[PDB]
Design a protein around this nucleic acid. Sequence first.
DNA 1: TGACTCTTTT
DNA 2: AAAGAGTCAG
Length: 581
Amino acid sequence: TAKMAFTLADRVTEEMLADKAALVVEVVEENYHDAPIVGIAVVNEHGRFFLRPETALADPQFVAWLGDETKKKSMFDSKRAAVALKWKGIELCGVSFDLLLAAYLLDPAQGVDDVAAAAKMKQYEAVRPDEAVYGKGAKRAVPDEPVLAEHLVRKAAAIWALERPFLDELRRNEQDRLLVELEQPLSSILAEMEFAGVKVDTKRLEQMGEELAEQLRTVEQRIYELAGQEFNINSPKQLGVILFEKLQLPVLKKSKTGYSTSADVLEKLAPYHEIVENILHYRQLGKLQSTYIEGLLKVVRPDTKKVHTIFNQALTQTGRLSSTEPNLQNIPIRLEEGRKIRQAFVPSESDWLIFAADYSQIELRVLAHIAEDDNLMEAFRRDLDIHTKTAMDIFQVSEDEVTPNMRRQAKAVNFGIVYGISDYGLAQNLNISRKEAAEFIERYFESFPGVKRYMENIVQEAKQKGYVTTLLHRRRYLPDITSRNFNVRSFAERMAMNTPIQGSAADIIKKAMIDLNARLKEERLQARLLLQVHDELILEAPKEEMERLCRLVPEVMEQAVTLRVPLKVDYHYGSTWYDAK
DNA sequence: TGACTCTTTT
DNA sequence: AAAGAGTCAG
Ligand SMILES: OC[C@H]1O[C@@](CO)(O[C@H]2O[C@H](CO)[C@@H](O)[C@H](O)[C@H]2O)[C@@H](O)[C@@H]1O
Ligand SMILES: [Mg+2]
């Protein structure tokens, strides 16, 4: 392939500082926090340019251009560059188009994760995949300057050529505003959150780990006694031999590889031998120790004593965020021993507090809205306990006739409706038969005929159109909706049902984040957004701001969109994330 | 290195 | 429904 033409500049010139350009600020490290920038490419009306970062980032004019909002840039994964630049004390402004976010909105199923993959969607192939240039795994490395510069320039040239086709298709999809007014402003907001980080009380985590280590050694030794020998408890294969061969415990569930030792299998095995509950206890403690004490500690920055997560804004099929290093969206809450981990997440400044606000049943409320189910809407308009009310309806009983087991099962039905699990999935969850599960679902549709109507209609719409959409026009293609394989087709149907629910909830929280950031600034508060956990926002703020935030945050969240039923937000604050409960 | 298995969250 | 730790082939 002949090299694409470009100037390998030694110095920044005026013609590199046009008010419209494709810009590449290359951070090759997967985790971009305080990570090197290996090179820079600019493409504009005047030409193609490669700049060495030590030159560019020391040039007052270039830096000024980077921070000038009126100088428009087109990029791929602008958040990566923005954050890497934040660590160097440089502001990136004026990013008017992000090809990563554009490709993501166009079809999240494509898994677009480099410029090449995005370009391929429009039959543009004059750019290499990053993996071919940098290698992968242990072989991963930055190549020599000629190879590096050409690659960065080809990526920039691709972005420059692809902006128009991508924007055009977004417009046809009615997704132009979704990109420009939602995902892109959110991206700046996430960059600030990641950069700010969350303070961690490492000392408390460490002493927790010490306590766990003691309890782990105790249970582990007890396990060896009950087995009559030592083995690797964390090896499902070895444990399977102890349980199902040495101890002759029944085999209720198997895997592709051998015996299942899932927690739900073990729970059923407990009455047979004393070893089982000890194994369950071991795995609980071991999960906390390895994943949440040791894992968290590994990624706390020693300089700051903070964790700086990375939100992947371009991954999920539903439009949710995910987060990594650490993942702050699965910190334990359910069981008290796990929940205590949240005590280690503290405010980053003295006399500040953690403030958390969460939507109450936002997914079921969205469902009531999109389905226009009279019963479901009435229930939310009365702010009823939705699980108790669902139990009342399914079992045809009065509120005081609802037993705890009845409510538990109604709750599992709702969870099934919300996440679109199979009737086989409901059966598994409630430990009942499919016939019984199917009866539950059938009773539900009798009490909520509008939801049944919605399930039917959306599946048909997915068939006819080839995709489903959310409130704010996020899209998900479902080509498997026509499949002749039952399991493949059924999963697609469930995704047709679930996506406008989970996706629209994602849309709403994302808008609330944008609305909140603007309100905080207007109100001149020092409060800052730290985390989003699917349906909740977590902030830290001076204690003197708590009373104002108690009024402000739920109002912004509740008013983010207007639905046929109210949105409800609960809130708490305290000296640690644990206490904000 | 990657397929597997298991566990945590919403 | 949909990140990461550990094990065990290759
Ligand atoms: O920068 C986040 C952004 O990068 C992508 C690849 O383009 O993911 C990379 O970065 C993530 C966080 O460090 C990694 O988890 C991921 O494995 C890595 O490829 C995008 O998927 C993401 O939106
Ligand atoms: Mg909640």
